[PDB]
Amino acid sequence: EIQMTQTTSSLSASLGDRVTISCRASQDISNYLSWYQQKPDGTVKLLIYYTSRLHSGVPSRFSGSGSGIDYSLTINNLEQEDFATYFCQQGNTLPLTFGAGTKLELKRADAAPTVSIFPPSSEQLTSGGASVVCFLNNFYPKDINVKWKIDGSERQNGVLNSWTDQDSKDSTYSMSSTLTLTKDEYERHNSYTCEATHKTSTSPIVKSFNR
Amino acid sequence: NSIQIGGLFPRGADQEYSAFRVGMVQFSTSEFRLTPHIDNLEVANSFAVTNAFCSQFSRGVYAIFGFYDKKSVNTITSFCGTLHVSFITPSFPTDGTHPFVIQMRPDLKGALLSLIEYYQWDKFAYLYDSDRGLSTLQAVLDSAAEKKWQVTAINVGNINNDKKDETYRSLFQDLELKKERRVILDCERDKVNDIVDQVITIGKHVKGYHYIIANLGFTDGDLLKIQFGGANVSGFQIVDYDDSLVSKFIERWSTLEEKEYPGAHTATIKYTSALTYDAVQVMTEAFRNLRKQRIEISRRGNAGDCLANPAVPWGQGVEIERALKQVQVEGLSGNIKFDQNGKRINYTINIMELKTNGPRKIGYWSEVD
Amino acid sequence: LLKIQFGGANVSGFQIVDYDDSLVSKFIERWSTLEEKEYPGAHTATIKY
Amino acid sequence: QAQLKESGPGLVAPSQSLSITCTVSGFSLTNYGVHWVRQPPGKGLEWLGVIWAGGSTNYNSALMSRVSISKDNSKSQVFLKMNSLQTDDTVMYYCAREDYDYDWHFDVWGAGTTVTVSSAKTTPPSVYPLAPGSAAQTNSMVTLGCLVKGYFPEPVTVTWNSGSLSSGVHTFPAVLQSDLYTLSSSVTVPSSTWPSETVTCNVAHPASSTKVDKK
Amino acid sequence: ANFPNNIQIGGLFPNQQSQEHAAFRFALSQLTEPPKLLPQIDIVNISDSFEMTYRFCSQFSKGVYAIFGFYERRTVNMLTSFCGALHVCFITPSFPVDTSNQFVLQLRPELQEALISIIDHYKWQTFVYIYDADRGLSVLQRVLDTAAEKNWQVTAVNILTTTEEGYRMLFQDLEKKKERLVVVDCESERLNAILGQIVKLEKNGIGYHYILANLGFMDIDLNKFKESGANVTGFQLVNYTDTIPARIMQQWRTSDARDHTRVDWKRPKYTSALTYDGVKVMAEAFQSLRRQRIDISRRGNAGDCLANPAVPWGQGIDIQRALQQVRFEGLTGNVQFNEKGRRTNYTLHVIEMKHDGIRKIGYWNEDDKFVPA
Ligand SMILES: *[C@@H]1O[C@H](CO)[C@@H](O[C@@H]2O[C@H](CO)[C@@H](O)[C@H](O)[C@H]2NC(C)=O)[C@H](O)[C@H]1NC(C)=O
Ligand SMILES: *[C@@H]1O[C@H](CO)[C@@H](O[C@@H]2O[C@H](CO)[C@@H](O)[C@H](O)[C@H]2NC(C)=O)[C@H](O)[C@H]1NC(C)=O
Ligand SMILES: *[C@@H]1O[C@H](CO)[C@@H](O[C@@H]2O[C@H](CO)[C@@H](O)[C@H](O)[C@H]2NC(C)=O)[C@H](O)[C@H]1NC(C)=O
Ligand SMILES: *[C@@H]1O[C@H](CO)[C@@H](O)[C@H](O)[C@H]1NC(C)=O
Ligand SMILES: *[C@@H]1O[C@H](CO)[C@@H](O)[C@H](O)[C@H]1NC(C)=O
Ligand SMILES: *[C@@H]1O[C@H](CO)[C@@H](O)[C@H](O)[C@H]1NC(C)=O
């Protein structure tokens, strides 16, 4: 079947620009494509019909072109509401397998993530568990690596860094990585460091956490 | 599965296009998924029509749906019969026999002659058009010469819109010399309105006249100004609103929004759109029967150019031609059945008369009786 | 009256202004030239009584 | 105008069926078709099934032995019953209808409902406080913490100070960790309001109905 | 320079040996003044629209400036549309159609006005109409309109539709009346095939008057009409008794004497004269274009036929304007074209034959309706 795959994984730009998201194809689709936008809440809407027309109700700035096996949609001027995802669906041969699609967002300055480590609470430490949470807030862009180290040994198992979406006002993201381990692991350790490397700085910001 | 077809529509076919899309939405089947390529292009000329035909054939389509006029019919018929590409059309039937052409509009000469013989007319006028062919005029002339009638033909097609006031009045005054009151109108849904307006202006709709609208759609044109005049007229109707399926389609048709589907908020419906819906149904049934026949009708998309010489057609062409000729399913116009040539057979044409309260049915016509 | 003059039945009506008169003709000439945006109902060859 | 509202259970154990109903509102159910497409979390939405208006269905070659859609012209609802649910079925499903605009463009698209296929039981949410260390004034917006770990099923309702002191709260999205949702919150409370303000993490378990508030 | 010595000319003919290809070759053989015309003759079925379109597109891609060839009722709409959309002239000696663009040059004059004038002069009020469904479709409407205006009694009958039984039926129907007034307008071969059957009905000759609307009245086999009480009156366009026609006759006679011609020339028709006149028109137009210092060339190297969108040709407009303003005394008389592209400023000599008497009634023209002699 025609497995439409999007080339650009995630592209972002500032307001007043003209982005161009591409969409490849496994075989000939006879220009029977559609570029539908999907907001972050879940509501979707069709914006491109037959890869050359615009649906009724879509903005006049959105447009597209391309024929054969490689198509692409180009917007006129980016805005605040236009910063969302854009999926592609090829309904030439059943079953119609939709594409992955990229995600458009606003660009900001290269800021370093504000690392802030903290130890566990009283009832949490008395239960047998210890989570070394290091909320690396104000991270721009999302390209930021982390490397935990407890008692000099680099911690790699037991940490889940679930990054958050970009802030609509601060134009940055925040992370949350907690070195989940047993009480005996935190007892043997003296000072657990949380080294986080971002794109704004070359040196990793280590945040120690003494017992 | 995917079946690529072709779609040709002239400038101003918004209602026909909306009916085509509605029929494509309604007739959905898991056996195959159609993928038409609609190309809006005026069928008045021939160069653009040939260009559109070649563009639709370069993709490697199986069936082609499109209209044609009295001028661009020969080239379309030849290109269809040469490349063995099937063709479906609701326009006027061609002259003689023509392979790979599946028409949808039944013949009207037989019903017209039957109505004339039933009304027992001796001398009358005949106002025809040059866009629906010259076959019906020749048939009427032959019937008049065989039955010793006093007929007269006036070409109202070359009448320009600038001198419409003088030309129509002058021809009506000239017709008044022979003291002829019976007039037969044979035009499309546009010229009949102008003729009715001219008759209303000159005051000839008074009781004592009888008009005959030679077309498949009688309720299509405006009739709110003739039924109050007093001159009883008669017309031909192909679709009957008393049927359950037609009434359900009309109920599900008026509720459609006009912004998306243009020409939807209307009680009546054009006969061309109904024939297009029936043609979509026929194509769907033929594709389903072909898929159920366990035949490998799928071919490669390497057809190339249309003007290739020598052109070697494929057996799938005659296969789908036989499949389309061997179909029989109900529809808006009633029972659908084709002969070996492609013309419609076993059809029921309803004759309608305009009364004070509105149009009333007086009978039906057929090919057997 | 374009729908009655071609009907066949003659009608008769009274008139108060004489368009063939010199003063009325001059007034019509200086009146039909006025734009419809400023003065509504100006591009009319006839005029109400 | 047309619309499409999908209904689901939200939570279902493993080795069970996944039935979802979509009431067709604004259009007919016996005239136009209806399709069901499953959208994975953070991936491309794949077509699961399509119930044509003629009565037949077009099941994809991915889960043809596990998905089966049924039509109901009376209630105008297309029941999407997905049997033999796998462990990775914690995604959202949304149904839509086709159209005809010279191309197969699905115009009428519903909002869709989410589902969390997990065989684990319900667990009360346990919130833990993670302050910034000392009780001094670090900045104008003191970044607080709420380690709401051990919540089942994901996710829970965690609010800082019951919504009162939530200005600049950079709460991260919760994640699953051994059948437990370890929610992470960080409220930006003031400096002088520490600890004058009661920043209570009212961890309200949605699947367990356990509302635990901890400051 | 302005016009090269090598000029391509496309030729479309339904068959090789039809006495028209030889006339075309003889007309091109006499042209010795530059620009020299190089003929590209192609045999194609004039009834098949696909083959006609293929040949037209091939000639357009080959780089031909002006195309010459006939057509039929089937291929009457595609050729004019292609010529109006590609800005390419087309000289056609066949029957003229009412719906024609300004790029086609219908050499055959109009025969409806002359026929109406002859009917008005003969004081006819009730007569049967005999026509064919091949080319008799434009004059029938005008005849019906004239009958409706002047209160006539016409009864049109088709040749292809009426069989032998239908022929006998209509003949006995016209015989039921006192005066038998029949008018016919068909091709030369079709009129000969009809005369092969009408001779057994006109044996008595009780009030029979025929009006053959054919320009080749002299080429008809009048033996079937002889020894019968029937009156014939057919139009004539070519006059072999004048000075220039007799000079061209002697010229082709000596040309056939010095070297044998492919096809014989005895009993010449009017299609050969029309082809000669068209070749002379093309030669005069090309000479006028060359002498006026106007550059002519292909705007695009190997221009495609089905190129989207269509590429116009201003040089085609210039060629049309040159071919429209030509004027000389050809073989069929004076040659002159109007803005519509049809032929004007011509003379039609009506000839009535009775008792082996070749009596010339007069001549026809555009300004005057009819003048006797
Ligand atoms: C309908 O119009 C026709 C046209 O005059 C008329 O019907 C004729 O009806 C009368 C009365 O039954 C018959 O005697 C004639 O034979 C009919 N045909 C004609 C006159 O050609 C009549 O004016 C109208 N009404 C009816 C009921 O026919
Ligand atoms: C030129 O083309 C025409 C059009 O196809 C040919 O006419 C046909 O004649 C054959 C022979 O019986 C019939 O089977 C077709 O049905 C005819 N076509 C139509 C449209 O009726 C004609 O034969 C061709 N000329 C030559 C010499 O082959
Ligand atoms: C054709 O047009 C020309 C003028 O436009 C006229 O005929 C000419 O005939 C006269 C008589 O000998 C001569 O001056 C020339 O032979 C022609 N003139 C030109 C300028 O070529 C006449 O008006 C029309 N009819 C005929 C029969 O010539
Ligand atoms: C015509 O169609 C009707 C529809 O019911 C059918 O009963 C009848 O047999 C058909 N007749 C022919 C000759 O096909
Ligand atoms: C035929 O012509 C002759 C002489 O020209 C004439 O006497 C005769 O009346 C004509 N016949 C008819 C039927 O007009
Ligand atoms: C045409 O030919 C006839 C037959 O000889 C002749 O009488 C007549 O004069 C010729 N016409 C002209 C204009 O010379």
Short mmCIF file of C-alpha atoms in Angstrom, two decimals, chain D:
data_model
loop_
_atom_site.label_atom_id
_atom_site.label_comp_id
_atom_site.label_asym_id
_atom_site.label_seq_id
_atom_site.Cartn_x
_atom_site.Cartn_y
_atom_site.Cartn_z
CA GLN D 1 -24.01 21.73 10.03
CA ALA D 2 -22.74 18.20 10.61
CA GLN D 3 -20.86 16.84 13.61
CA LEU D 4 -19.57 13.59 15.11
CA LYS D 5 -19.45 12.78 18.83
CA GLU D 6 -17.59 9.61 19.82
CA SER D 7 -18.23 7.76 23.08
CA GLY D 8 -16.01 5.27 24.88
CA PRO D 9 -15.25 3.69 28.25
CA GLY D 10 -11.86 5.34 28.61
CA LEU D 11 -10.45 2.50 30.72
CA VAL D 12 -10.51 -1.21 29.91
CA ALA D 13 -8.52 -4.21 31.13
CA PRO D 14 -6.43 -6.37 28.78
CA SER D 15 -7.81 -9.29 26.77
CA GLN D 16 -11.14 -7.45 26.46
CA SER D 17 -13.12 -5.85 23.66
CA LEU D 18 -13.07 -2.12 22.84
CA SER D 19 -16.53 -0.93 21.77
CA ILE D 20 -17.01 2.73 20.83
CA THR D 21 -20.14 4.46 19.52
CA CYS D 22 -20.27 7.57 17.33
CA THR D 23 -23.66 9.28 17.05
CA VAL D 24 -24.00 10.86 13.60
CA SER D 25 -25.40 14.34 14.30
CA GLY D 26 -26.14 16.84 11.54
CA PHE D 27 -26.31 14.34 8.67
CA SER D 28 -27.94 11.07 7.66
CA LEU D 29 -26.59 7.62 8.50
CA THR D 30 -27.91 5.66 5.50
CA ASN D 31 -26.78 8.10 2.77
CA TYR D 32 -23.14 9.00 3.49
CA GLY D 33 -20.40 6.65 4.64
CA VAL D 34 -18.35 6.65 7.83
CA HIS D 35 -14.78 5.60 8.60
CA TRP D 36 -12.89 4.89 11.82
CA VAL D 37 -9.22 5.87 12.08
CA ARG D 38 -7.04 5.20 15.13
CA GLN D 39 -4.45 7.82 16.08
CA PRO D 40 -1.50 6.63 18.20
CA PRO D 41 0.06 8.94 20.80
CA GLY D 42 2.69 10.97 18.98
CA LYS D 43 2.52 8.93 15.77
CA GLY D 44 0.66 8.85 12.45
CA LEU D 45 -3.04 8.02 12.48
CA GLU D 46 -3.76 4.73 10.70
CA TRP D 47 -7.11 3.76 9.19
CA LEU D 48 -8.72 0.96 11.22
CA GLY D 49 -12.00 0.45 9.37
CA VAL D 50 -14.60 2.09 7.16
CA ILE D 51 -18.30 1.17 7.25
CA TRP D 52 -19.71 2.05 3.83
CA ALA D 53 -23.27 3.28 3.43
CA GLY D 54 -24.12 0.23 1.31
CA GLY D 55 -23.75 -2.06 4.35
CA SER D 56 -20.33 -3.58 3.68
CA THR D 57 -17.10 -2.66 5.47
CA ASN D 58 -13.47 -2.12 4.47
CA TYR D 59 -11.20 -3.49 7.20
CA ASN D 60 -7.51 -2.68 6.94
CA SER D 61 -4.89 -5.41 6.56
CA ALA D 62 -3.32 -4.48 9.92
CA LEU D 63 -6.01 -5.54 12.43
CA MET D 64 -8.49 -7.33 10.18
CA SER D 65 -8.75 -10.19 12.70
CA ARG D 66 -9.32 -7.84 15.66
CA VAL D 67 -11.50 -4.95 14.41
CA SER D 68 -15.13 -5.09 13.29
CA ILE D 69 -17.43 -2.09 12.80
CA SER D 70 -21.22 -2.40 12.88
CA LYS D 71 -23.83 0.01 11.51
CA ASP D 72 -27.13 1.09 13.05
CA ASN D 73 -29.41 3.19 10.84
CA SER D 74 -32.03 3.49 13.60
CA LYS D 75 -29.88 5.01 16.35
CA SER D 76 -27.60 6.69 13.76
CA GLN D 77 -24.54 5.30 15.55
CA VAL D 78 -21.62 3.35 14.10
CA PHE D 79 -20.47 0.99 16.85
CA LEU D 80 -16.71 0.38 16.51
CA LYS D 81 -16.06 -2.84 18.44
CA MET D 82 -12.35 -3.73 18.62
CA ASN D 83 -11.87 -7.22 20.07
CA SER D 84 -8.62 -8.69 21.41
CA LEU D 85 -7.14 -5.42 22.64
CA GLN D 86 -3.37 -5.39 23.04
CA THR D 87 -1.28 -3.76 25.77
CA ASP D 88 -0.23 -0.92 23.44
CA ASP D 89 -3.85 0.15 22.78
CA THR D 90 -3.56 3.25 25.02
CA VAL D 91 -4.31 5.72 22.23
CA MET D 92 -7.19 7.91 21.03
CA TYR D 93 -9.73 6.93 18.37
CA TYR D 94 -11.69 9.38 16.22
CA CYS D 95 -14.33 8.69 13.57
CA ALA D 96 -15.00 10.79 10.49
CA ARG D 97 -17.12 10.88 7.33
CA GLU D 98 -16.07 11.07 3.69
CA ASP D 99 -17.10 13.67 1.11
CA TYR D 100 -16.81 14.43 -2.61
CA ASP D 101 -14.85 17.51 -3.72
CA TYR D 102 -13.05 15.98 -6.73
CA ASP D 103 -10.91 14.06 -4.20
CA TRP D 104 -11.30 11.77 -1.19
CA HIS D 105 -11.26 14.56 1.39
CA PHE D 106 -12.67 13.70 4.83
CA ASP D 107 -14.30 17.01 5.73
CA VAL D 108 -16.59 16.09 8.65
CA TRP D 109 -14.14 14.94 11.35
CA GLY D 110 -15.16 14.42 14.96
CA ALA D 111 -13.21 15.19 18.11
CA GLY D 112 -12.78 11.55 19.14
CA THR D 113 -12.33 9.93 22.53
CA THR D 114 -9.29 8.48 24.29
CA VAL D 115 -8.73 5.04 25.80
CA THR D 116 -6.24 3.56 28.28
CA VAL D 117 -6.03 -0.22 27.78
CA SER D 118 -4.40 -1.35 31.03
CA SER D 119 -5.00 -4.47 33.11
CA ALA D 120 -3.90 -2.73 36.32
CA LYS D 121 -6.40 -1.80 39.02
CA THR D 122 -7.13 1.60 40.54
CA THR D 123 -4.68 3.11 43.02
CA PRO D 124 -4.99 6.24 45.19
CA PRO D 125 -2.76 9.14 44.12
CA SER D 126 0.05 9.81 46.61
CA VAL D 127 1.44 13.35 46.40
CA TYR D 128 4.81 14.29 47.88
CA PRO D 129 6.30 17.76 48.48
CA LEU D 130 9.58 18.77 46.83
CA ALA D 131 10.49 22.28 47.98
CA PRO D 132 13.46 24.28 46.61
CA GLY D 133 15.61 23.49 49.66
CA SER D 134 15.99 26.39 52.07
CA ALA D 135 13.08 28.57 53.17
CA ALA D 136 14.74 31.78 51.94
CA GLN D 137 13.76 33.97 48.97
CA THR D 138 15.44 32.52 45.89
CA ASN D 139 13.54 34.53 43.26
CA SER D 140 10.28 36.38 42.70
CA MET D 141 8.67 33.10 41.53
CA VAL D 142 9.72 30.30 43.89
CA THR D 143 9.52 27.04 41.93
CA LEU D 144 7.62 24.60 44.14
CA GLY D 145 7.23 20.85 43.61
CA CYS D 146 4.59 18.14 43.86
CA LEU D 147 5.82 14.56 43.39
CA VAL D 148 2.48 12.84 42.77
CA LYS D 149 3.81 9.31 42.26
CA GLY D 150 1.90 6.05 42.43
CA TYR D 151 -1.32 6.94 40.61
CA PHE D 152 -3.43 4.44 38.68
CA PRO D 153 -4.88 4.71 36.18
CA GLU D 154 -3.13 7.55 34.37
CA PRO D 155 -3.83 10.37 34.51
CA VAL D 156 -4.97 12.08 37.72
CA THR D 157 -6.17 15.61 38.52
CA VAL D 158 -3.36 17.49 40.30
CA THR D 159 -3.93 21.16 41.13
CA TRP D 160 -1.59 23.44 43.09
CA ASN D 161 -3.29 25.37 45.91
CA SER D 162 -6.69 24.34 44.47
CA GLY D 163 -6.07 26.70 41.55
CA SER D 164 -5.46 29.75 43.75
CA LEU D 165 -1.64 29.91 43.64
CA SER D 166 -1.01 28.56 40.14
CA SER D 167 0.62 31.53 38.39
CA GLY D 168 3.51 30.34 36.25
CA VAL D 169 3.03 26.73 37.35
CA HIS D 170 5.20 24.73 34.91
CA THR D 171 3.58 21.38 35.61
CA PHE D 172 5.04 18.61 33.47
CA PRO D 173 2.86 15.89 31.91
CA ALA D 174 2.54 12.68 33.90
CA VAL D 175 4.05 9.41 32.66
CA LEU D 176 3.52 5.73 33.42
CA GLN D 177 6.08 3.89 35.54
CA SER D 178 5.25 0.27 36.48
CA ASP D 179 1.47 0.78 36.39
CA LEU D 180 1.85 4.05 38.29
CA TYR D 181 1.46 7.63 37.05
CA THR D 182 4.33 9.69 38.50
CA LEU D 183 2.96 13.19 38.01
CA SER D 184 5.44 16.07 38.27
CA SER D 185 4.29 19.60 39.12
CA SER D 186 6.21 22.83 39.74
CA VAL D 187 4.23 25.86 40.93
CA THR D 188 5.84 29.30 40.78
CA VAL D 189 4.70 30.65 44.14
CA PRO D 190 5.93 34.02 45.48
CA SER D 191 8.92 34.49 47.75
CA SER D 192 7.17 36.33 50.59
CA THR D 193 4.21 33.91 50.37
CA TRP D 194 6.47 31.03 51.46
CA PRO D 195 5.08 29.56 53.56
CA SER D 196 2.32 32.15 53.99
CA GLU D 197 0.46 30.67 51.01
CA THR D 198 -1.09 27.19 51.25
CA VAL D 199 0.17 25.57 48.04
CA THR D 200 -1.67 22.27 48.48
CA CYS D 201 -1.29 19.66 45.73
CA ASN D 202 -4.87 18.36 45.56
CA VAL D 203 -4.04 15.13 43.74
CA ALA D 204 -7.50 13.91 42.68
CA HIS D 205 -7.29 10.39 41.26
CA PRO D 206 -9.61 10.26 38.22
CA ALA D 207 -9.82 6.46 37.97
CA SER D 208 -9.66 5.82 41.74
CA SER D 209 -11.78 8.76 43.01
CA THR D 210 -9.08 9.54 45.60
CA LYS D 211 -8.68 13.27 46.29
CA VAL D 212 -5.54 13.78 48.40
CA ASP D 213 -4.36 17.31 49.18
CA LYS D 214 -0.81 17.86 50.45
CA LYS D 215 1.16 21.08 50.88
#
